Design a protein around this ligand. Structure first.
Ligand SMILES: c1cc2c(cc1CNC[C@H]1CCCO1)OCO2
Ligand SMILES: c1cc2c(cc1CNC[C@H]1CCCO1)OCO2
Ligand SMILES: *[C@@H]1O[C@H](CO)[C@@H](O)[C@H](O)[C@H]1NC(C)=O
Length: 352
């Protein structure tokens, strides 16, 4: 069980002004720290945030959070469930900012909601340094779905923060799960007039203005004012990052298919699905630490059965261990694992 701590800095809040927080399980014999970012879509204007507050309120408020959470998958402390990092210090950061972890804006006379995702991460890191993170050797910032995109937006800022605070020896790394999306041609098209018809490029462009969203500085300098939405797409922001980042992405991600307006498959949709797999594989060709199986799924690293899927005979926990060794090619210990077969579930280890 990981135990809830609400932030001591009361100015760093969830959407409705309640304090943000983190769940922690310490491992006093370890200098490894895992900080995991929760996912769960986003909201980008007053009307769709109001709807989210009625039926997805745990993603906008700490008012109803439980005192404890059980660690699962990569957050499990049992080697049977977590062969990779079972002895690490474990941190789960709830997603209560609805901003893909990018926002830096308080609730005020002109803002009904606070969007503070980028500042929540910074304050969690700060308060953990007084609870043992000062003695760390490695801090892995991990996350799933919107939290995986959050890793890409924030990992270099965590590295800069620790350097400026006087801890240049802590090695900061990223693990982005199911947060590597394509701004591709959709299978059917709708102009952006409301929540469900607005493609991610248009929704994120509006969201950044609504959230006062923040992107990594080198990527911001490339795309410049008005074009910061480009940095929410992994294949565009990843080449600007300095920290080591491992990319986990299903080739036929269900959330990608949803935003592509895809749900007996005839030729047009067969060609569309096969081309998506090819394009995703192409964007990962020069990513040296990656795990990309040919399955229709979404998220993996905090699932209890995350040990089951394999690419070319190698599991995800093994690939992460091989990554650790490479950051001290390795015989029998690969770090780049991308399926080549062209249809969902052509890999027999795909989750059922
Ligand atoms: C009031 C103002 C709001 C809001 C929601 C509220 C309702 N009260 C929420 C409090 C009770 C428990 C912790 O926060 O959403 C944005 O502005
Ligand atoms: C998240 C973050 C993104 C993104 C796309 C997503 C996916 N969320 C939208 C889906 C969730 C469930 C139904 O619509 O584009 C780049 O940043
Ligand atoms: C609390 O957080 C805000 C927002 O980042 C920051 O400006 C302020 O300095 C923080 N206060 C303390 C005491 O850390």
């Amino acid at each position: 069980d990981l135990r809830l701590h609400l932030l001591l800095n009361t100015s760093v809040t969830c959407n409705d002004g309640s304090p943000a927080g983190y769940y922690l399980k310490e491992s006093r014999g370890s200098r490894r720290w895992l900080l995991f970012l929760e996912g769960g879509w986003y909201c980008f204007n007053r009307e769709n945030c109001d709807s989210r507050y009625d039926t997805m309120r745990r993603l906008m408020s700490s008012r109803d959070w439980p005192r404890t959470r059980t660690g699962t998958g990569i957050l499990s402390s049992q080697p049977e469930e977590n062969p990779y990092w079972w002895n690490a210090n474990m941190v789960f950061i709830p997603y209560c900012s609805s901003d893909v972890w990018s926002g830096a804006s308080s609730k005020s006379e002109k803002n009904e909601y606070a969007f503070m995702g980028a500042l929540i991460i910074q304050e969690v890191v700060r308060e953990l340094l007084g609870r043992g993170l000062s003695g760390a050797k490695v801090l892995l910032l991990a996350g799933s779905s919107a939290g995986g995109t959050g890793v890409l937006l924030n990992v270099d800022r965590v590295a800069e923060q620790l350097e400026k605070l006087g801890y240049p020896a802590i090695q900061v790394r990223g693990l982005a799960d199911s947060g590597w999306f394509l701004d591709n041609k959709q299978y059917r098209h709708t102009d952006c007039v409301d929540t469900i018809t607005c493609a991610p490029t248009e929704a994120i462009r509006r969201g950044i203005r609504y959230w006062n969203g923040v992107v990594p500085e080198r990527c911001r300098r490339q795309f410049q004012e008005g074009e910061e939405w480009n940095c929410f797409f992994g294949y565009k922001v990843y080449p600007t990052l300095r920290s080591p980042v491992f990319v986990v992405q299903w080739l036929f991600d269900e959330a990608q298919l949803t935003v592509d307006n895809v749900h007996p498959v005839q030729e047009g949709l067969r060609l569309y699905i096969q081309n998506l797999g090819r394009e995703l594989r192409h964007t990962l060709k020069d990513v040296p630490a990656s795990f990309a199986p040919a399955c229709l799924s979404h998220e993996i690293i905090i699932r209890s059965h995350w040990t089951d899927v394999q690419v070319k005979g190698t599991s995800l926990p093994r690939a992460l261990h091989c990554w650790d060794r490479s950051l001290h090619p390795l015989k029998g210990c690969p770090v780049h694992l991308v399926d080549s077969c062209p249809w969902p579930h052509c890999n027999p280890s795909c989750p059922t």
